[PDB]
Amino acid sequence: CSSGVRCWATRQAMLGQVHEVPEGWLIFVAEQEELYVRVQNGFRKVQLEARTPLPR
Amino acid sequence: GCSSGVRCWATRQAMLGQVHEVPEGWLIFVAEQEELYVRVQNGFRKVQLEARTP
Amino acid sequence: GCSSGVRCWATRQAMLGQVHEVPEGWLIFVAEQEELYVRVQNGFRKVQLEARTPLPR
């Protein structure tokens, strides 16, 4: 398999295409600034610390 | 001028047979275990993931 | 409708010198302290990583 990172502005525009995304791809949604990984039969949210202006 | 990416393998043993050739800074996905790692110098950092969402 | 990716730097100082050219939604790896961030608008969200191990743990 192959992989990469796909991006969407809104949770809506994304969930309209999450079906299209192959397993092992990462998914970013700007609305909530969240990151997911596509797995078999679902998706798993990556745990992120809160936004900061500095790389902490 | 450094770009990496995400690489995926179906099983952990398939990944281990090829990971010597993965540079530091790449992400590694192992599908069978649904595990995601950052490849670092001679090692791995596991990414913390939440439970599967349908 | 966009695509991103993963960019890497050896040091945090070199990364910050370039981060204005990194769009929101890209991932940033820094070899200094082996950190991984999601680039967000004018900032960062640090990925939660477990401590490095020699074997995928």
Residue numbers in the entry:
A (entry chain B): -1 to 54
B (entry chain C): -2 to 51
C (entry chain A): -2 to 54
Pull text from the paper.
We describe the development of a biologic that takes advantage of the proximity of the N-terminus of bound ACE2 to the three-fold symmetry axis of the spike protein to create an ultrapotent, trivalent ACE2 entry antagonist. Therefore, we sought trimeric scaffolds to fuse three ACE2 moieties and leverage the inherent symmetry of the spike trimer to maximize avidity. Thus, we determined a trimeric antagonist fused to the N-terminus of ACE2 would require a short peptide linker and would be less likely to form inter-spike interactions.
Cysteine mutations capable of creating inter-chain disulfide associations (i.e., C®-C® distances less than 6 Å and absence of obvious steric clashes) were identified: G22–F'26, E31–V'37, and G(-1)–L’5. The formation of inter-chain disulfide bonds was confirmed by X-ray diffraction studies. High-resolution crystal structures of the E31C–V'37C and G(-1)C–L’5C mutants afforded clear electron density for the disulfide bonds in both mutants (respectively). Furthermore, the thermal stability of each collagen disulfide mutant was assessed by DSF. The ‘wildtype’ collagen XVIII trimerization domain produced a calculated melting temperature of 84.9 ± 0.2 °C. However, two of the disulfide mutants (G(-1)C–L’5C and E31C–V'37C) either produced very low or no fluorescent intensity up to 100 °C. Considering the high melting temperature of the “parental” collagen XVIII, we posit that the melting temperatures of the disulfide mutants exceed 100 °C. Given the poor expression of the G22C–F'26C mutant with our trimeric ACE2 constructs, we proceeded with E31C–V'37C.
